[PDB]
Amino acid sequence: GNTTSSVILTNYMDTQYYGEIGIGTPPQTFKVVFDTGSSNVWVPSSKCSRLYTACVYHKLFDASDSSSYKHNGTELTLRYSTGTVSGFLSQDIITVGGITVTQMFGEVTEMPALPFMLAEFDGVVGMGFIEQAIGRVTPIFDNIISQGVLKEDVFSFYYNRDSSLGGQIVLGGSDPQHYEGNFHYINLIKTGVWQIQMKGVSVGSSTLLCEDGCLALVDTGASYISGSTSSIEKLMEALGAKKRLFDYVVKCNEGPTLPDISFHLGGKEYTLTSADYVFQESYSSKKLCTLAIHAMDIPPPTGPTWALGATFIRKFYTEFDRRNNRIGFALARH
């Protein structure tokens, strides 16, 4: 194998980046987010009660329609920073791009309205390690590496700004049409988790934060940049941003005057400008404009960490390299 599949993605409102897979014989197709922050796959099941609003809006996997279906039945609960889900395990043939794989995957049967009634996607595919997998189930990428078809043991993310391609994941390599310069690489703190050491967070020329270093999760499955609550208190107090309930906001006229936020990863600074993290939904002082940053307390062993989600990955085209356990960033071409 020197094969390199690619999955086209849809950007919805800059917060949801989902693409298509097919499961079963003949193939039942689902939209899913590719999450580097988790290691499981699931979709809603035909067995999800219609009392779940989320279950009525999304598409259901039907085992009884599937001649590739092998039964497992093991229960699970999958807990995400935003939202959780419980169902049961099924084996079926799944395909992603050209690639086809026999995968264990969760058929979901309780699906909370919040946050899922808002999901344009039906499903998720965990792009993380077996160390984070509930049930210790082999994740899908390990499963594709065992095939020995990828020209490289890597997959690369491109995430566009609204709208025309919405984004793209390449399995087996990167797509140059979508970045410039060369990749810079940081090794993983430890194998098991898509997570690197971060040296510092500046707000404008001066290092506000992470002075004696901290952790950074590169998470394709997060719409935003997150930090701990105390890192974000202070970061927002730097930006004069004002806490709403869940979100932070600035008045829209000041949006474009906000300073650069930069992230020191490895031997380089990754810089975000206001155009990258303020939702400029207006320019009027009447109006309030949200920021693509928030507080998200991730518990140990992973946490406390920041997560670098879509806000960052839109700016910097990202490569996850399994063979060498590292992540590459390059500037994205839009």
Ligand SMILES: CC(C)(C)S(=O)(=O)C[C@@H](Cc1ccccc1)C(=O)N[C@@H](Cc1cnc[nH]1)C(=O)N[C@@H](CC1CCCCC1)[C@@H](O)[C@@H](O)C1CC1
């Ligand atoms: C509306 C917001 C504020 C943008 S959001 O954060 O609620 C969005 C959710 C993703 C989402 C969007 C729309 C419908 C459903 C779900 C989000 O970003 N969730 C993150 C939260 C997070 C931020 N920093 C760390 N976590 C999230 O929970 N992502 C998980 C993936 C996500 C896959 C898609 C559905 C929900 C879980 C998972 O990657 C993380 O838990 C673990 C690594 C820490």
